[PDB]
Amino acid sequence: NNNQVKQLNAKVRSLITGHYTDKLKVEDNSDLSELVNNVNDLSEVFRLTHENLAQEKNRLTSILSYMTDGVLATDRSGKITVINDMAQKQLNVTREQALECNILDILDDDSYTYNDLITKTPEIVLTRRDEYDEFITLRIRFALNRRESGFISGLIAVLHDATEQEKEERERRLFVSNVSHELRTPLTSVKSYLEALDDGALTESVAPSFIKVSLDETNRMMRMITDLLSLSRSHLDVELTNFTAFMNYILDRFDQIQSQQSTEIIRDYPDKSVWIEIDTDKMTQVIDNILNNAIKYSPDGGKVTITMQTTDTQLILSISDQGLGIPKKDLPLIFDRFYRVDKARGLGLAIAKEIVKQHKGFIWANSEEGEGSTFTIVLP
Amino acid sequence: IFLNYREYKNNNQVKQLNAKVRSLITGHYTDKLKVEDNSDLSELVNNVNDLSEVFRLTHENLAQEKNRLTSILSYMTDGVLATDRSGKITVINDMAQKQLNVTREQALECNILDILDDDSYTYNDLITKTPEIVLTRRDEYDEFITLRIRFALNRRESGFISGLIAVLHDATEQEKEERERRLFVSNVSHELRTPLTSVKSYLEALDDGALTESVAPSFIKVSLDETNRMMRMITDLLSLSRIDNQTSHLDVELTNFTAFMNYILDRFDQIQSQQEIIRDYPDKSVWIEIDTDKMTQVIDNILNNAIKYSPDGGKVTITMQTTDTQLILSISDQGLGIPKKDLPLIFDRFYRVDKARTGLGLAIAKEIVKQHKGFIWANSEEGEGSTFTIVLPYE
């Protein structure tokens, strides 16, 4: 009695410090025994309601945890308040790192919390939040935490990883840029031949070949197409050919092309007869492009010097020009794949370098303003 | 005699206690009690007096968390829904109720397999956890939706498997872009290849043993004109490419559009006539910042369109007026016109009613206009004929 109060007092002090405890036994039908019964029943009742509350809260945070896409939410201000695992991985971040931070702290792309809360925007970030060169492209869409009153609790962003789709896009973008750039010169050749030859179809002293080199060129352009597609969706072939003859074919093409008619001189600096195993087509591609920008960059007429010499390291072919070529800012990048697409406005010749490397060859360049550019190709 | 009093006070304190605690068991909070300072019933009364505040504090905090989470998971942009070992939808948020045109109520009467006879089971959906795609109405008017649903493995606080978690992403616009871009590259291919296989089939006749005897000049004509078509096409394609890579940006300079137009149209009457009716309207200073190069691209292209659309009577009317917020340029021709079904389609790349000859051109025009923050569209009756209208900011 005096004791039962000590005991029950104890039980309740336990319940206070969060420590649950078994029921006390109802001794008599006393009036406080009713109180003992009531405290028992309370400890149990609130126990259930508690385990239940935590059960559902947990179910929620569980869903958010094992969820596939990334989710984060912020106060009206915009400091991160919630950020799930997935979002953490996508953004290269821990909950720790994230909670002292603000959505605007995403690559500092200069948009405002109010722009955000007004427009509930659907936009796309790009970052290397993944250690090495590996990148990730994330599409983040926003929504409001609006309460019934209209009050905005904060922001709710979902981040889908679209880092692949981005790729497939730059691949096809790439294909278009390529096919448009690479068909140019063969197309201009076929033009020049059929064009000059639209007057001079007779002159069988030239016409039989004319038609044939133009035919071979449109056939080259088709095998070109298939290649360029498969590049984002290549293949090599080789035969032994007379290389001086090669350069004379290739160069005679350009020669003809310039004879009509707007507004540069190229001199063969080989000698006569060099035999080497290569792919006619793809080598023609390489030389074609190198000559392309060689002429492109050359001011006032043209100093374009094709000088090729042979040794025991075999073929060493050089193409020299005027104008400028430096700095070492552009120099190293001009051979990298996505250059032509991701640029800021050089030329191309990545595919050139690659057709050279597939020949187990080397291809470098030196160039200085008001001196010109020299490209060099080394074949086995 | 005040011993009786003491008994009274105590028992009444205990009764008061049973009041408070019985009212706790029912989940209702009542005011603190009066301490018998200093009885030992004071200690108990005060203990319950605190216990209440405890239950309440904990419950309010936990509640706040649970509700933060709850709001986040429903007001979030994507469809979310959870299930149990069965697959029966246990959870579904706003966005998902919308994407699926259902209600939490009628939705929870559903199991996850309940879609278009999907042909997948829970027992093989938990293993693969792999995402896939459904196209469904589930939305209002003339429109249909497409959902990318990524499945995920749900679990408890213990290792055990709770059920499934599906996120549904309304990705119809994305899907649309993707599709049309694909068709774009496909087009570039077919479109360049077929002139090639054409010119190749000709030159191949001009060598296989038919070289320059009977139809030669005509084969050189065909082949030449065709390779020039491929030339122009590849030029257009380069331009569009620059536009797609956001490299091709504008260069604007405040110009008198009325004069610009006269220059351009003189230039045009020129470059045209060798082997058509051009009618001018403006006649007054219309100062507007444009990129003369690009804008000339546009106008020249639309004029050429007008031409490719006429028998010989042309009748191209350039008519351009100015409201207080816009310059309205319009190029009208009494030609064939355009099917109302091709009408919303003609500015598409490599889209042609029937060619018959490009073939982008019109696309470039639209894109440049859009670059000026303007608009352009077609109208047609098939008689009289098609007319294109461009809208540009101010003057």
Numbering used by the authors:
A (entry chain A): 37 to 269, 275 to 304, 309 to 390, 398 to 432
B (entry chain B): 28 to 302, 309 to 390, 397 to 434
Manuscript excerpt for this entry:
In this study, we report the crystal structure of the entire intracellular portion of VicK (aa 31–450), which comprises an SK dimer with one signal transducer, one signal sensor, and one intact kinase domain. VicK crystals diffracted slightly better than 3 Å; however, because of strong anisotropy, the final structure was refined up to only 3.3 Å. The overall structure of VicK comprises a dimer in the shape of a long slim rod. In addition, the HAMP, PAS, and DHp domains are organized as dimers, which are connected by long, straight coiled-coils of helices α2 and α6. The VicK HAMP domain appears to be a stable four-helix coiled-coil with classical knobs-into-holes interactions, wherein three pairs of hydrophobic residues from helix α2 form a central hydrophobic core with knobs-to-knobs packing, and it is unlikely that structural alternations of the HAMP domain play a central role in signal transmission. The VicK PAS domains form a unique dimer, which is mediated by a leucine-zipper. The dimeric architecture of these domains looks like a butterfly, wherein the DHp domain (aa 199–269) is a four-helix bundle of helices α6 and α7 with a phosphoryl receptor histidine located in the middle. Interestingly, the two monomers of the DHp domain bear an asymmetric fold. However, the upper parts of helices α6 and α7 are remarkably different, wherein helix α6 bends ∼25° at Pro222 toward the central DHp axis and α7 moves ∼11° away in the opposite direction to avoid a possible clash. Although the overall conformation of each CA domain in VicK is the same, their positions relative to the DHp domain show dramatic differences, which generates an asymmetrical ATPase dimer.
Bacteria respond to transient living environments through transmembrane-integrated sensor histidine kinases (SKs), which act in concert with their intracellular cognate response regulators (RRs) to elicit necessary adaptive responses that are critical for their survival and virulence. The SKs and RRs have evolved into a two-component signal transduction system (TCS), whereby stimulation of the SK autophosphorylates at a conserved histidine residue to initiate a signaling cascade. The VicRK in S. mutans, which is an important pathogen in caries etiology, regulates acid production and tolerance conducive to dental caries, including proton expulsion (F1F0-ATPase). In addition, VicK has one HAMP domain and one PAS domain.
